[PDB]
Design a protein around this ligand. Structure first.
Ligand SMILES: *C(=O)[C@@H](NC(=O)Cc1ccccc1)[C@@H]1N[C@@H](C(=O)O)C(C)(C)S1
Length: 257
């Protein structure tokens, strides 16, 4: 309804899935439509690693070489020939959307093929990781590669983080990164009521103005999060997104709760 209106105001396509984990209440709009998840996949990879490595053991270091470095790695770019702890990899991936950190997290997990296995165990047969960064960012409406539906992606985010194989410490370390992430400030954070806490991970693919934001939103007073997945995109390959679209979509969706 009003989301269709926002699709008209911004000449864009909105994908929404939101789940209040307390009530089990869901808001869906183009929720079974495929979108490039882009960097929002970093939250998923980070959480999967965290299921396998206890907080105390995030101090394990791993070697970084030139072959590991991919574009848009503001943190990892300085670790060629150096060691980095898994904790700092996760921090890089989440806070700076470091692409090299995210690939190394997927490697730690055991590779794309293992992320796929985990996804399927969580009943997610939609989220479709195929490539590492940055190649996963070359979205095409014609390919399913590195795409998901807001519903499949949110359900996974809910089963992985919102409840709940993560220890209290690993769950806190991930969510704090997401809460403290100043790079998602123009998205969901921008549209939610100022007293709501928002723990997000944003994404922007190279093509079709694919701009996304996923978050754990805590309406003031509630501790149970509302999982919010907003995927947007446009008709043209070189289209530039408008973050206000996501900000407005989040505002609208939050009234439903
Ligand atoms: C996650 O979505 C990452 N996206 C890319 O690596 C592709 C890309 C898209 C637009 C500009 C540059 C690179 C990260 N998200 C972007 C972004 O927010 O635009 C980063 C440049 C932070 S990498």
């Amino acid at each position: 309804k009003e989301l269709n209106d926002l699709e008209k105001k911004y000449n864009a396509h909105i994908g929404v899935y939101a789940l209040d984990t307390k009530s089990g209440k869901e808001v869906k709009f183009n929720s079974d439509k495929r979108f490039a998840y882009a960097s929002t996949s970093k939250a998923i990879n980070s959480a999967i690693l965290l299921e396998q490595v206890p907080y105390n053991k995030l101090n394990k270091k791993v070697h970084i070489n030139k072959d590991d470095i991919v574009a848009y790695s503001p943190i990892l770019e300085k670790y060629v020939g150096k060691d980095i702890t898994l904790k700092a990899l996760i921090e890089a991936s989440m806070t700076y959307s470091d692409n090299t950190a995210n690939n190394k997290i997927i490697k730690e997990i055991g590779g794309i093929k293992k992320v796929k296995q985990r996804l399927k165990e969580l009943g997610d047969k939609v989220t479709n990781p195929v490539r590492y960064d940055i190649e996963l960012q070359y979205y095409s409406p014609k390919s399913k590669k590195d795409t998901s539906t807001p519903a499949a992606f949110g359900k996974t985010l809910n089963k992985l983080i919102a409840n709940g194989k993560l220890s209290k410490e690993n769950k806190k370390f991930l969510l704090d990164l997401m809460l403290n992430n100043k790079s998602g400030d123009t998205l969901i954070k921008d549209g939610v009521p100022k007293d709501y806490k928002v723990a997000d991970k944003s994404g922007q693919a190279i093509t079709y103005a694919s701009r996304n934001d996923v978050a754990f939103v805590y309406p003031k007073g509630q501790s149970e999060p509302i999982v919010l997945v907003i995927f947007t995109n446009k008709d043209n390959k070189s289209d530039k997104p408008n973050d206000k679209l996501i900000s407005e979509t989040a505002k609208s969706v939050m009234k439903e709760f």
